[PDB]
Design a protein around this ligand. Sequence first.
Ligand code: FAD
Ligand code: HEC
Ligand code: HEC
Ligand code: HEC
Ligand code: F3S
Lengths: 540, 413, 136
Amino acid sequence: NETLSADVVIIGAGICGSLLAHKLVRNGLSVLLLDAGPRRDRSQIVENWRNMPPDNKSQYDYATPYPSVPWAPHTNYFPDNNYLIVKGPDRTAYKQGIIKGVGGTTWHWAASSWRYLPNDFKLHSTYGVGRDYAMSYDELEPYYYEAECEMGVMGPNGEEITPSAPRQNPWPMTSMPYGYGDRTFTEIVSKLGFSNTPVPQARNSRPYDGRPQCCGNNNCMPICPIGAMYNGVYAAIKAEKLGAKIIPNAVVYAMETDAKNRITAISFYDPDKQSHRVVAKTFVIAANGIETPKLLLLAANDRNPHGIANSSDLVGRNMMDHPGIGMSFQSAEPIWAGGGSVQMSSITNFRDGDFRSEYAATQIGYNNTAQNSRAGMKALSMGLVGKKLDEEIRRRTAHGVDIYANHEVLPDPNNRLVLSKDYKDALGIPHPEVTYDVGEYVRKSAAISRQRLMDIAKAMGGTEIEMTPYFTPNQHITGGTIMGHDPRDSVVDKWLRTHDHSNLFLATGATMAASGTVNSTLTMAALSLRAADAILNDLK
Amino acid sequence: ISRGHYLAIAADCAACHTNGRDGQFLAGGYAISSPMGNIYSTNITPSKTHGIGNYTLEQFSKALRHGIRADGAQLYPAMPYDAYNRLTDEDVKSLYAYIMTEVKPVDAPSPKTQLPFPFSIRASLGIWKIAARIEGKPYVFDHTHNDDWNRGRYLVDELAHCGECHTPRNFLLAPNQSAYLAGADIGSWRAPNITNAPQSGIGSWSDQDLFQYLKTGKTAHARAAGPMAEAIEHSLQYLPDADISAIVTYLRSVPAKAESGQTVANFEHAGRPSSYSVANANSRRSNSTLTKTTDGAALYEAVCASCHQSDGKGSKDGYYPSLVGNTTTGQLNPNDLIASILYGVDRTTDNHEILMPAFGPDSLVQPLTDEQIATIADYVLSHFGNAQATVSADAVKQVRAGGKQVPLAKLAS
Amino acid sequence: RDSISDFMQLSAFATGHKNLDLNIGSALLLAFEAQKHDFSTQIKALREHITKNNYQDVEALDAAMKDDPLHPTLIQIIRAWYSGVIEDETNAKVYAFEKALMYQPSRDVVVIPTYAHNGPNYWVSEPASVDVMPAF
Ligand SMILES: Cc1cc2nc3c(=O)[nH]c(=O)nc-3n(C[C@H](O)[C@H](O)[C@H](O)COP(=O)(O)OP(=O)(O)OC[C@H]3O[C@@H](n4cnc5c(N)ncnc54)[C@H](O)[C@@H]3O)c2cc1C
Ligand code: HEC
Ligand code: HEC
Ligand code: HEC
Ligand code: F3S
């Protein structure tokens, strides 16, 4: 290829990138979509998941169905592919899941799209902890609902569930009714004083967008056999049909800029390690919370030896996530987890308060994934035979309970993604290496989170209670390129344009300022649509 | 609801005069995939500018029955004026009153139909009507049969115009009276034979089954899809139960039209107790895009077995129909099944919505290629429906294109 | 073709159930014979042991030979028939899903995670008890 010219390029065909591409092609702009992963198809992922060993199915394995392509490897911990090097006091708290391929990691999310509270956007102003968004909640609510209607998100339309984000107009859906497990968990935590509320899900309670109604397979992680949730592959397909050019297996590595700091072109590899110069009048980097900083630190040139968009020396710095402490036990009272989606209800009673100045807010969610695989594997592990084995399988699948609690981390600039100086893939691109730390804030929040979870298990009369002494990752990779006003104190502005390079936008978790107390991909989608407004204003 | 509203519902006039679920009420703009091109239905709201507000009673009767516009231009046969021609004068007057008074006028010009020479000139249709033997005496009560049979015949022939799509067309593309209700290809979809043939038609259907299909669109052995889903959703569902009973009574008396090479009714096809081997599917792990899984059973299991389970007997609830004992799968000609794979069943009965995930090239859930869809359809026919039915990739591409180009359509060259 | 017959007979005895797929059994025999060449010798020995000591159910066939190194392969075979895997790593092949007997005793209520249960809104109905055995 002599040159792959375009108008607007978006590095990374994930949910953020696919929404960006769809909105921009809908307005008549030549959008070129580069993706590190390959062209990925839903049914084959379903077939691979069906054929995973039940040992990997008992545990929550979500990377085996997606092959880790050598040119664009993604995390896989059961063989420990070691793509995401994590060290620090909580290296196990950032073993995030990411899928490379058209659609991105949201190929296998639970569709738990959430609207952040107004105080999540002014944490720093109201409590002095964290860093503040340059944008208020009101400035994001239009685009927030735009994304909500784009993916067809569920929600308890009529309910005063908990102090939550005010809505100018209700959810496009009504939350599908709870299963037995969700109802019983709600009753238990209500007797414990916790408020169990329906979780807004980018999922079809009624037929939407030509995707069927959720029939409750309970395989929201890691693949929907009927596609009743929403995945970024939907917006990628819509953009491709509308005119967007998509090249899978396009791993960009470096980009050239002029003395004006206006980056002029980008280059990427196929698996065959061939460079192709891509030139467009406005580049957008929508790769990941993890991959955007690695790309920005990997594309340092002579003009910017410290990394592109790294004038503040903060790209890669200030990592963020939701440190979840997942605890699984055996309920004394039957639950029958599996009815509906894997994530139907969650305790939102502690999403905000005056304690955020001291310790992190906690969102105690109950995992609704079916325990038939877990019950079978555990009952077969203890070497039971015949009718006793059948009875134990039924018992452990009717009593299997998984409970977790997620928190938020404060901005620690020491949480770099300094690319490992020793490990490289077939393309020679270094793996993203995280020097992760949670903080005394997270330790203090978890100090009461453990007691809360133990009380919840006690109310169930639980047995063989297993608690992770560490923090489990929730793959809500936010931070890394923190937004703000000052070019020397933050990476990008309110409109998600890099201060160093006005023609470069980034719409991903990296620009997220405060991790919040709940899932974030709805917030990434809203930020992506705000970015789309930004390029729309830029090029007319 | 008034008599005019009932007649408009039974005539299903809102099916083609409202472009899709969206769009204004009877504002036109709907694209109809005619064999020679795309024809846009016109606005009939009482709008003095872009509607039919200027239409008088006799002008409206001419437009409805004889297919002649106000300016004298012959209406295209997308208008079932050959089916509304025998409509009674009183019903025509009631429809005129309903259209003039009971629907809000909309001022939005409809797209103008553009067809190749000589389909562009809307004047050769006089010879077409003469050769079609349209006229067309207004319907008269036949005393040989009871009142229910007469009402059913009125509904099927005049108002609901079931013959517009369930009757084949000749080389000149006019309704074939010899093969009455014998089943026809309407482009992407095929309307099955609905005569009283026990094997070829629907004679073996139970009365309750036919009533359920014509009222709600769902049955243990048949689900309304595509244009039939649209008809059920828009017109048939609002029909009172007495009218559905009359339609059933008439349908159980139409002459049979047996098909050659057919021996078992479309809903009595049992399924072989066979499936794919999970062991064979281990080899294609860590291999996405399904390019290498050319076999059919594993392809069906990966793509569609989530709802219609591995045995193919559908969901126990009945929400997902059994592919065994299904009229769409049991049909000797598999055009309906190919259309269901391509576009899918989307029927909204009583505000409750069935929705296929489409599986065409522009599918949102799972795109599939022509050969891929051919293999999976072959597996479905062999294991669940008519074994004698075979599907090729060229057949799938043809179904996508809109069926066979009729020999009259080749003239546009 | 005797070996497949003895395999099916012993397996139906061991799992305590009769309705077992023949294709899955053939795949299991192929995998077992690929894993160990001496599978046939010890399987015939086990069959002879059951015939000579006239075993009734599988609880005795589990308890009686705790020290015999043949009980390992009985545990292996029941694990295969209930789970569908032979080995333990991620690479291990799956020969039975949606039909594995560990999913069956809860099939009536808890949905097999990928294959849809009845209807799209079934879970609103209350489930059955824990001590009732659906079938098989
Ligand atoms: C198991 C799991 C469950 C989750 N559940 C939820 C949930 O319930 N709710 C919720 O809100 N969130 C959830 N998430 C989080 C959610 O998946 C992500 O936060 C979101 O999808 C962000 O995706 P993204 O498009 O920004 O990045 P990604 O989707 O990770 O990446 C987009 C694409 O960018 C490409 N790319 C990356 N780097 C480069 C490069 N240098 N050059 C070219 N291309 C590149 C990759 O190939 C990839 O395909 C979950 C995540 C996981 C792993
Ligand atoms: C894999 C590609 C398939 C195949 C081969 C079929 N389906 Fe479906 N299907 C679904 C629903 C809800 C209906 C019927 C309407 C309803 O009851 O509301 C159907 C219907 C069919 C038919 C019959 C069509 C007709 O014209 O009668 C056939 C032959 C058929 N299907 C085959 C639902 C779904 C899905 C959602 C869970 C999925 C996935 C599929 N079907 C996939 C397939
Ligand atoms: C007048 C009210 C009627 C009646 C009594 C029937 N139809 Fe239709 N129909 C159409 C299509 C495209 C199909 C097949 C869909 C698919 O292939 O899945 C059908 C189906 C039927 C049946 C089922 C028969 C069987 O499946 O064997 C029956 C009993 C039936 N119809 C009766 C199309 C149309 C249509 C547009 C062209 C119109 C108008 C009607 N049908 C109207 C009627
Ligand atoms: C399935 C499609 C369909 C149905 C049902 C239908 N129409 Fe139409 N109608 C059309 C099309 C297409 C045209 C224009 C084609 C032509 O010009 O030959 C048309 C034209 C007309 C016209 C001519 C007006 C003009 O300015 O073109 C009138 C009046 C009309 N229809 C009224 C009705 C009434 C009343 C009904 C009964 C409710 C009805 N239609 C049912 C499709 C339909
Ligand atoms: S996989 Fe899909 S069908 Fe429901 S159980 Fe999850 S949203």
